Amino acid sequence: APRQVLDLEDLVFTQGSHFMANKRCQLPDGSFRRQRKGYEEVHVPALKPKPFGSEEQLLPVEKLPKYAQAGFEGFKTLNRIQSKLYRAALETDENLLLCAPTGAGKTNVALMCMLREIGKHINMDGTINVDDFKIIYIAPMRSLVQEMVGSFGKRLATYGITVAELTGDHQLCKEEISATQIIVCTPEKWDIITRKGGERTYTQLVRLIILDEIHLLHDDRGPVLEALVARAIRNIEMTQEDVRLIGLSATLPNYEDVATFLRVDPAKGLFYFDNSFRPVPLEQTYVGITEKKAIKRFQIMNEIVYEKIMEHAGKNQVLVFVHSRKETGKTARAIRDMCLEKDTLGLFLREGSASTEVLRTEAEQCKNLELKDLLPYGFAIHHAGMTRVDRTLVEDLFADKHIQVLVSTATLAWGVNLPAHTVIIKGTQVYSPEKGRWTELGALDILQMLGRAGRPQYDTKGEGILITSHGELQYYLSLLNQQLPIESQMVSKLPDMLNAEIVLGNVQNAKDAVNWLGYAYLYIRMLRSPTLYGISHDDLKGDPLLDQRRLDLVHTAALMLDKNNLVKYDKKTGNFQVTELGRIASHYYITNDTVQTYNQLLKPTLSEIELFRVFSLSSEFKNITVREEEKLELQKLLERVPIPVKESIEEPSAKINVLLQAFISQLKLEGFALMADMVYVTQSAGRLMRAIFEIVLNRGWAQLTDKTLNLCKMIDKRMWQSMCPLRQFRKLPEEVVKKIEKKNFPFERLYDLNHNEIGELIRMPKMGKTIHKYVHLFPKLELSVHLQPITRSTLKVELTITPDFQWDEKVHGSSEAFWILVEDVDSEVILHHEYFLLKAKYAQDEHLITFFVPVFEPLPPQYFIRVVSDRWLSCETQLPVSFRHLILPEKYPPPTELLDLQPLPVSALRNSAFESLYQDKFPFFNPIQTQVFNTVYNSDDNVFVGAPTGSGKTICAEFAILRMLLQSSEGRCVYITPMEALAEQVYMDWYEKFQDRLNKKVVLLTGETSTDLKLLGKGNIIISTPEKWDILSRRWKQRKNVQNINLFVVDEVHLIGGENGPVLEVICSRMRYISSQIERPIRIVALSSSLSNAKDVAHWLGCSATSTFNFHPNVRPVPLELHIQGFNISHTQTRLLSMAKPVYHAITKHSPKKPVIVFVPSRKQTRLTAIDILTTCAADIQRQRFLHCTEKDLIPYLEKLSDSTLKETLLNGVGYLHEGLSPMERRLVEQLFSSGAIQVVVASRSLCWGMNVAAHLVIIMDTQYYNGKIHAYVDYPIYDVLQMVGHANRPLQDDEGRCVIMCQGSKKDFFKKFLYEPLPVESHLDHCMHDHFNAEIVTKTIENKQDAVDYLTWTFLYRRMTQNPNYYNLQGISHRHLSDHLSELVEQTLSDLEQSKCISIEDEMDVAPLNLGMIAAYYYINYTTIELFSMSLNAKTKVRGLIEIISNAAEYENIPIRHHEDNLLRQLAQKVPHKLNNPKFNDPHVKTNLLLQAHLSRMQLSAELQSDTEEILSKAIRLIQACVDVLSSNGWLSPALAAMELAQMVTQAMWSKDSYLKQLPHFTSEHIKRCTDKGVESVFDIMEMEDEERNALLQLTDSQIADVARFCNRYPNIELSYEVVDKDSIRSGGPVVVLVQLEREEEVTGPVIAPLFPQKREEGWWVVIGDAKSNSLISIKRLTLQQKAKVKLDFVAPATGAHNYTLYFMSDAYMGCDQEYKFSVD
Amino acid sequence: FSSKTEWRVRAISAANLHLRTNHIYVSSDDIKETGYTYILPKNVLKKFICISDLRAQIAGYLYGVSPPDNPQVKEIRCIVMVPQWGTHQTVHLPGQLPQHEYLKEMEPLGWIHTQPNESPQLSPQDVTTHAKIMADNPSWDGEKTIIITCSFTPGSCTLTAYKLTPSGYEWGRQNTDKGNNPKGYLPSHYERVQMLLSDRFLGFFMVPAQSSWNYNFMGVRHDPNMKYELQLANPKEFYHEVHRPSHFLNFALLQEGEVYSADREDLYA
Ligand SMILES: Nc1ncnc2c1ncn2[C@@H]1O[C@H](COP(=O)(O)OP(=O)(O)O)[C@@H](O)[C@H]1O
Ligand SMILES: Nc1ncnc2c1ncn2[C@@H]1O[C@H](COP(=O)(O)OP(=O)(O)O)[C@@H](O)[C@H]1O
Ligand SMILES: [Mg+2]
Structure with missing residues (x-):
């Protein structure tokens, strides 16, 4: 039924915690009422302890379990109640509730509940290993939290477990409290910190939460505890992982209700003890006063105090709790002056004159407080205000009983624990700035301070005296004897509570909301006492479950949140949507009225003058008013403030404003009312001002976000900016600071000065050093920027932050926070902003941030890049980024229109044999294909087809291939893709498409030159990746098989843009050069995604504009719906975690019943996300929704599995794919998905390229990944992202395809811009340049500098340079500009190449290859690599050195470093044969050294690093051989032979x-x-x-x-024969010729057998000659034999001709075939 | 100024200066046609109006170039703010002219200043100021540099542009007396010149290197011979905290005031 709106005002309880729900109370036994004039006085005696039950004894610290006993020292026996429940404490995970009176010692019960969990994780050889568990202790008061962490630390220290208070600001201390266990906090702290998500990184490691003093449920603060526990329970129901909950409460009825709330089984989990169990029995005195007139009352209570105190004036102790700060000492001196007015009666508080140590009270004389007056007499005062240490010095004095009268405040009862024989509570009323008026103090305040009555040791029984107003006299009886109900104040806060739950995503709609509220304390109270909560019994009968009331309830909250714009919720769906305003509101615990006040009030143009007023209008302050008496002082304060309030007169706004200013300006106030008020205002001000900043920043309004963050800092630090920043270091002397403020010497001018020059300013040179320290302690960043234009609309910015300050963790702590924000021309609009956080470790490490910004039609003079510390005041650095010289790219022509064509049938090609490989797949070609067709098929010319991935360009290539097929029987075609994965993916298709059906042989290139050569020329279609087709085809002049190719196809040419792009560019360019020289045309067909600059690519690759088809991303066979989801959490774990639920929702929304792929940042993240998808799958009440077959069908597939969790995830219809899975496992999962059995697959990002199974919806989760090398996260390469997106295509069936990309705030706009528009693509050749010039010079394709420039003109770089010159750092678009640019380019490339001795530059004009470069070019090795080799390898180098030298090779820096690989590799490096010299463990060279040694020692590692090992090994041999060549050329015998030996050792995996x-x-x-x-x-x-x-x-x-x-x-059997030709005739300088002759009786078959190597290899051999005595390599040669050989080598004869040498023979593979023969010549 | 009450009235006033920003008038009067014509980009004008105050004159220095192949128009591309202070009728700014790198590309076009009350003449204080700049600066050309007076009209802003005539330049070089009616002052001394606002291009600001520009709140810290450097960054508003240190440096307090209300209730972080 439709819901109805209700008023939450008359439905709440005003004066909560004073509520007193029962209107009837009870006597205790011997209690009596005796009323006097003006005051009723009630007396109750002490309780009588329950007699010990039959055979019930205390438990010593002996007889309870061995481990827990530790840390109980000093204590011999357990308390009666402790001893009662210890069993259920340590033996059960059942939830606990105890109700026991104050003084029973409840903590030590809960302590045990902790010592159980602390024991749950234990080891033999280590104790309490601490990363398994964390405990959360929630205590009601701050002092109590402090002191508790204080003593808990000491106690539990024997375990070495680290316990701390959670006072942390979220971001600086998270990574700090990461390592902290058993964390203590106030319920509020836990609630904000959970609303932000600081908890969601902690949780699931939490098995235990303690609710201490849970009776706080009755307080106005109650709803918080209710929100905590409700969340915890409601959450456990989803996760199925449970938690112990231990409640502690004062003794009060409604215990079973709190039990229901905590899900405590009443049977075994409930514990109740009445007021008789107070360790020191309590005689209760309550005097209520009947006097209406306060003026007479303030006499009467004085006198009651006097009589009561004189009653105990004998041997006894009294303690007075006043609720005033100053009146602690105003109450004293009244007692004193009265005792003096008594004619010295009441005095002599001792046993005599000298007795009872009056010299104790006299000799303690000089003290900080007013004590000097009171101390000579019998009494003193205590409170936080007047002193720090003398409070402890007074507490010491009270414990030892030298003062029998002490008047104090509630913080004394809540702080360090000391009791008093008898305590007396004066007045019970306090001043509440939150309520704007006076109100009786809270339940917990009295309970705490009166539970201090009587000593455990020195006392027999305690008494206590509560002096109150007669009207409240009933109330205070219902408490201290258990009459009082515990009721929930939840209704008042219900709108705010609901918001924060929507904000966390824990409630989507109305239904989830009622489900949530069904977990509240208010729910069970509304169930068991509807009469009280506003429900008549008849409509309760009408709706027993309260479904309709819980639906009505929360409906009004929904409406309130909608009206204030926290939530967009339409009544029809019942669904909620969060707004950023809502999130800000939740995160700052600011009410929903205040937040809408901010929404309507806040505008871009607000001055500070106005900002303060808007602050003052916060609904949180609604009850603050201005009193007549204080309006005298407020005026003075009003004229002494810096920011004009004068907009307002005296009204609340003014009071609050002038107060905030007073606090910041640090001003003391005479009135007490104002002081308390100010405190309230300023404490709430942090959250308030901050939510303002967050809002106004999200809007983007620059000026006001400055004014607001600065205000925030000014509140935090309690100063204006106009004051010296050195003040934020409290370590500094005040007079010195004031002194430097005296002379005006701008702060940033302190860095120029040394230690002496500093002191000379203020003429205080003794300070000169210390000041300096601080000046360099003050956080300072310096920043550089590299800017290049991308499109006329957008520029790219690389910001380099270099820390300029000295880090000290006792100042900067674990982390330092900075906002970087780029502001527009006027510093008006914020074009972009990121939260940058520099951790402790990384001070001094420059961080690189990359981000894009837009530009607009009146191109502006500059932007500004601002960086500012979050918490630090006056700490900022601005960086003008000037566009004065900027040259924007040429605007890009419109994509060629998609014509409307009759869709082409497969019946077009008149060849039947061709039709066959299409017709049974799809009936028609797509519009792209049909528009390209006639050009690519019926015609011979070069084409370019861009269309966004998923457009079907592959068969566009296949068209051209078919044409070539008709052209010639033997017609040759080479096909290229930049991705090896994609290459294999193409090969599998084309092998069946062509070789199977059309009989035409199809091949796929590989590593080895030989095998690859043999491969092509036998094949019609050669599939290859750019590197394979560079090494082969560099030499093309000699290889006729390169030249004779008919067709050449480049797929995904836009990939030129990415790295390993230059190689692609260079091979296409070369291809063109060849077609230039061969005199025959070689058709080139290039395929790209949508390209904005396609024109350039075409012009480069020689396509006429008429044959150029460049299509817009909106042209796709199957339309795509793209959605981008911004997440404002920068910390990646929290972000990644908090997008878990949205994943599920994205499925249920966009593609409920259709296939879904989810890409993830981590190899392991795939498992976890499959799990989470399943665990939140349960939530929906819908289990195994993604499995479309019965479990009986999946069994045949599951039999093939190793991974145990994969079995589970697959069983419910999910499954995952990653690096570590066996190819069979992967094939299986793919099969299950495509066949339709499983509806969802989570996949590692790496698998985006090589994946052959598509989907309907694709969800990309968190576009960053982790890089160990710089220790930072880095964004997914854009083309990758586009590929993942293209993976949602299902043209056969779907009419649509869908993608949701969940990413960080920063990265949102970038995707919004570049996923929809066609992409620009630029050349990288300018950077990766040397290798090719070297290789090309080697082929004599570049014979001299001119040839070099000419070569440059064949490239794509040449094309682009003039198109967007600022990108290539070319400063003009002119002719001589470009010409001079290319000139400078070959100039420095050839210079750098000549410096490295890879080439020789003659006359300054010509070039020739040298030894080094020749090697490099031969083995396809980076030039710097073999230069490093050249300066490294020396005469004495051996395998130890060869390992590290070959490790530092450039091709091994592609090896990455994963999450926490700094410990992993250290653990491996410990156990390896060769150690290293202070190795850094994030360096890939070190990693490859260690992996290599690991391979040599045949150590079996994890498959993760094993894959890595295999990749290293793949390219190892080449490098090794290169070393052989460098060494033999350099002429050293030992290292050379040892290097060949290393070749062998790598082949066979063994040490020398x-x-x-x-x-x-x-x-x-x-x-x-x-x-x-x-x-x-x-x-x-x-x-x-x-x-x-x-x-x-x-x-x-x-x-x-x-x-x-x-x-x-297979092992080599080889017999040689060696002779010296004409031995007897030899002269110095004469040639010596040694002829060697090889033969083999071994059967010639197959390759080398070396199962531990990833590559198949043949037998290489070195035949060396050398004089071993001088370590000289005299001669050398290399060969491959196979059953016969003849090898002759020569050298130049030294000296006289009477000499002797050594012949050597060696393999690159097998160990032990090495042959030496020592010979003599003459 | 009263230095207490006088500060605040004008301070909460100036927080509305941005309202003026969108109603401005420009003097159109007889065009000499042999003269130069100056284009002022609107953005700098807005910001310049926004930093000002309705009593103290603030001034800024004009820097620009003539567009290619169009020598008779001067685009004003930059305004420089230097350490200065005003009266209601004039402005005291230091002897040193702006020196800086971004400025090397352009020529000085004169200066612009706020004018609390609208007058249809160039104030003697101005012609005298301008002549006296010109005397000491050859860098400033008599015929090429102007004085733009920006006056606050009701709810509005309205501006005119003047050139000194040689008669004027000589008078002004000579003139001592800075009163509102000096001897020998004449309407023959100045000439109106043609100026247009523009949304076609954006101007930029130059601002003092180690301080800000507005010295009104410290008069003793300002000197004719004072030296300054510059930077690329925008001006802070007149009443901005920084221009006003003496006022934020008013705290006389004893810390122990905090002893009172030592109940600390926080509970949040
Ligand atoms: N076995 C024991 N030996 C000595 N003192 C004890 C013992 N058990 C409890 N106490 C006392 O009980 C007090 C703890 O108060 P407690 O009732 O735990 O307050 P809370 O309301 O925070 O649980 C401590 O001051 C401690 O001295
Ligand atoms: N005419 C067609 N009708 C339906 N689907 C097609 C057609 N042509 C290609 N496809 C589908 O498109 C997918 C490949 O898209 P394509 O754009 O060729 O890849 P790439 O973008 O890597 O070149 C194949 O899985 C194939 O199923
Ligand atoms: Mg493809």
Whole structure:
């Protein structure tokens, strides 16, 4: 039924916690009423302790479990109640509720409930390992929290568990409290911090929460505790992971209701104890006063005080709690002057004159407070105000009983614990600035201060005296004896509570809202006492479950939140939507009236003058008013304020304003009312001003966000900016600060001065050093910017932040926060802003932030990049970014219109054999294809087709391929894709499309030059990746198989833009050069995504504009609905976590019943997100909704699985894909998805490229990823994102496809701009340049500098440079501008190449390749790499050095570093053969050294780093060989031979000194014992073995013995023969010729067998000659043999001709075939 | 000024200056046609009006270039604010002219200042000021540099542009007496010149290097011979906290006032 609106005003309880729901009370036993004149006085005696039950004893600290006993020291026995429930405490996870009187010692019960959990995680060899659990202790008062962390620390320290107070501002201390367990806080703190999400990183590590003094449910603060617990419970129902909840309360009825609330099983979980269990029995005195006139009353109460105090004036102790600050000492001196007015009667508070230590009270004389007057007599005062240490010095004095009269405040009862024989509460009424008036103090305040009555030790029984107003006299009886109901004040706050739950996403709609409220304390109270809560019993019968009341309730809250714009909720759907205003409101705990006041009041143009007024209008202050008496002082204050209030006269606005200013200006106030008021205003002011800042910043209004953050800081620090920043360091002397303020010397001018020059300003040189420290402690950033235009609309900015200050964690702490915001021309609008946070570790490390900003039609003189500390005042750095020289790109022509064509049938190509591979797939080609068709198929010319990914361009390429097919039988075609994954993906298709059906041979290129060469020329279609087709085809002049190609196809050419783009660019360019020289045309077909600058690409690749088709992203076969979801949480864990629920919702919304793919930032994140999708799947009450077949069908698939969790996730219809999964596992998951069995798959980001299974909805989760190398997160490359998006395409069925991209605030606009528009693409060749010039010079394609410039003109760079010159740092668009630019370019490339000795530059004009460059070019190695080699490898280098030198290679810096890989690699590096010299563990060179040694030691690692190892190994051999060449050329024998040895060691995975037998398969280490004891040390030794003892040695297994036999056959048997030609005739300088002759009786078959290597390899050999005595490599040669060889080498004869040398022979693969022959010549 | 009450009235007033910003008038009168014509970008005008005050004159220095192939029009591309203070009838700014790198590309076009009461003449204080700049500066050309007077009309702003005539320049070089009616002053001394507002291009600001521009609240800290550097950044408003240190430096307080109300209730963070 439709809901009805109700008034929440008459439905709440005013004067909460004073409520007194019952209107009837009870006597205790011996109690009597005796009324005097003007005051009724009630007396009740002490309670009688329940007699010990049959065989019930106390428990010592012995007989309870071994571990927990620690930390109980000093205490021999357990308290009666502690001893009662210890069993249920440590033996059960059942929830607890105890109700026991004040003094029963409740804490130590809860402590045990903690020591259980602390014990739940324990190890033998380590204790209480602390990253498994965290405990949350919620206490009602601040002092109590402080002192509790204080003593808990000491106690639990024996365990070494770290317990701290949570006072943290969210961001600076999170990563601090990350390492903290058992955290203590006020319920409020927990609630804000949970609303922000600081908790959501902590939770699920929380097994226990303590609610201490839970009777605070009755206070106005009650709704908070109600909000906490409700959330905790409602949450546990979703997660299914439980938590212990331990409640502690004063003894009050409604205990079973609080039990229901905490989900405490009343049977085994409930605990109740009445007022008789107070350790010190309490005799209660209550005097209510009947006097109406206050003037007479303020006498009467004085006199009652006097008589009551004189009653105890004998041997006894009294304590007075006054609720005033000053009246602590105004109450004293009244007692004193009265005792003097008594004619010295009441005096002599001792046993005599000298007795009872009156010299104690006299000798303590000089003190900070007014005590000097009171101390000589019998009494004193205590409170927080007057002193710091003398409070402790008074507490010491009271404990030892030297003062029997002490008057104080409630903070003494709540703080450090000392009791008093008898305490007396004067008046019970306090001043509430929140309520604007006076009100009787709270329940917990009296309960606490009267529960201080009587000592546990020195006392027999305690008494207490409450002097109150007679009208409240009933009330205070219903408390201290258990008459009082605990009721919920929840209704008052209901609108604010609901908001914050919508803000957290825990309530989507009305239904979830009623479900939530069903978890409230107010719910069970509305159930069990409807009469009180506004429900008549008849309509209660009409709706027993309160479904319609809980629907009516919350409907009004929904309306209130809608009317104030916290939520957009339409009555029809019942759904809520959050607004940023709502979030701000929740996050700052600001009420929904205040927030709408801000919404309507706040405008861009507000002055400070006005900002303050708007602050003053906050609904939080609604009750503050201005009193006549104080309007005298307010006026004075009003004229002494800096910011004019004068807009307002005396009214609340003015009072609040002048107050805030007074606080900031640091002014003391005479009136007490004003003081308390001011305190209220300023404390609430932090949150208030902050929510203002957040709002006004989200709007983007620059000036006011400055004024507001600065105000925030001024409140926080209690000063105006006009005061010296040095003040924020409290460590500094005041007079010195004031002195530097005296002379005006601008602060930023202190950095120029040294320690002496500083002191010279203020003429206080003794300070000169210390000042300096602070000046350099003050946070300072310096910043640089690199700016390049992207499109006429947008520029790219790279901001480099370099810390300029000295970090001290006792000042800056764990983290320092800065807002970077780029403001427009007038500093008016904020074009962009990020929250940048520099951690402790990374001070001195420059951070690089990259972001894009828009530009507009009147191109402006400059932007500004501002950076400001969050908390730090007067700390800022501005950076003008000038556009004075900016040259914006040429605006981009409109994409070629999609014509409206008759969709082409497959029946177009007249070839039937062609039609066959299409017709049974789709009936018609898409508009893109049909528009390209005639050009690409029926015609011979170069085409370009851009269309956004998912447009079907592949078969556009296939068209051209088919044309070539008709053209020639043997017609040759090369096809390129930038992604190797995508390449294999193409190959699998094209192999069936062509080789299977059309008989035409299809190939896929690989690493090895030889095998690759052989591959092409046999194939019609050659599929390859840019690097494979660079190394081969660089030499193209010699290879006829490169030249004779008919067709050349570049797929995804826009990828030129990305890295490993230059290689693509260079190969297409080269392709063109070839078609230039071959005199035959080679058709080029290029395929790209939508490209704005497609014109340039076409012009470069030689397409006429008429054959250029560039399409807009809005042209797609299947339309796409793209949605972008901004998340304002910068901290990545929290962000990633808080997008969990939105994922599920995105499915249920956009694609409930259709296939869904979810991409994630992490390899492991895929599991977790599949899990979370399943756990929040339960929430919906809908289980296994994503599984479309029965469980019986999935069994055949699940039999093939290793991963145990994957089995589960698949069982419910999810499953995941990542790096570590076996290819069978992956194939299976893919099969299940595409077949339609499972509806959702979570996938690692890396798999976006190589994934062959598409979907309906795609959800990208969190576009950043983690990089260990700079220790920061970095955004997904844009093309990747576009690919993931293109993965939602299902043209066969769907009419649409959908994508939701959840990303950070910063990254929102960027995607909004660039996903929809066609993309620009720029050349990177200018940066990656040297390698190619070198390689090209080697081919003699660049013979001299001119040829170099010419070569440049064939590129895409050439094209783009003049198009967008500012991007390439070219300063003009002119002719000589571009010409001079290219000139300077080849100039410096050739110079840098000549410096590296890769080339020689003759006459300044010509060039020639040198040794180094030749090597480089040959092996395809980076030039810097082999330069490093050149300066590293020396005469004495050996494998130890060769490991690290080959590790530092450039190709190994592509190796990345993952989340916390600094500890991982350290743990590995500990156990490796060669240690390192102070290695940094985030460096990939170190990592590759360690992985390499690991491979050599045959250590089995995790598959994660094992993949890495395999990749290193893939390119290792080339590098090694290059070292062989550098060393042999440099002429060193030992390192060379050792390098060849290293080649072998890598091939066979072993260390240099090792058994040669371990190369054999199935050969253990324990085999080697008996093999070497037998006397067999090698493979040549086991050759002779017959079938008798061969398998009879250790183990006989036919399969393994055969597997070894094949190795033995494959192992090299090679006999050489060597001679010196004409030995007897030799002269100095004469040629010496040594002829070597090789032969092999081994059967020639197959490659080298080395199972531990990822690559298949052949047998390489070095034939070396050298004089081993001088470490000189005399001669060398390389060869591959295969069953016969003839190799002759020569050198130049030294000296006289009587000499001797050594011949060497070596492999690159097998160990132990190395041959030496020492020979003599002459 | 009264220095107490006088400060605040004008202070809460000036918070509405931005309202003026969108109603402005420009003197159209007889065009010499042999003269230069100056275009003022509207953005700098807005901001310049917004920082000002309705009593103290503030002034700014004009820098611009003539567009290519169009020598008879001067685009004003920049306003420089230097340490200065005003009266209601004039403005005291230092002897040093702006020196800075961004300025090297352009020429000085004169100065612009706020004028509390509207007068249809160039105030003797102005012609005298301008001549006396020109005497000491060859950098300033007699014929190329002007004085733009921006007057506060009701709810509005309204502006005129003047050139000194040689008669005027000589009188002004000579003139000592700064009173509102000096001897030998004549309407023959100045000439109105043609000026247009524009939304076509944006002007920018130059502002003091180590301080801000507005010295009104410290008169003793300002000197004719004072030196300053510059930076690219916008001017702070007249009553901005920084221009007013003496007032935020009014705190005489003993800390122990905080002893009172030592009940600390916080509970939030
Ligand atoms: N076994 C014990 N030995 C000595 N003192 C105890 C023992 N148990 C409890 N106490 C006393 O009880 C007090 C704890 O007060 P408690 O009732 O726990 O307050 P709360 O309301 O915070 O639970 C401490 O001052 C402590 O001295
Ligand atoms: N004529 C067609 N009708 C329906 N679907 C098609 C058609 N052509 C291609 N597709 C689908 O498009 C997908 C590939 O899109 P495509 O744009 O060719 O890839 P890329 O963007 O990498 O070139 C294939 O999975 C195929 O199922
Ligand atoms: Mg493709």
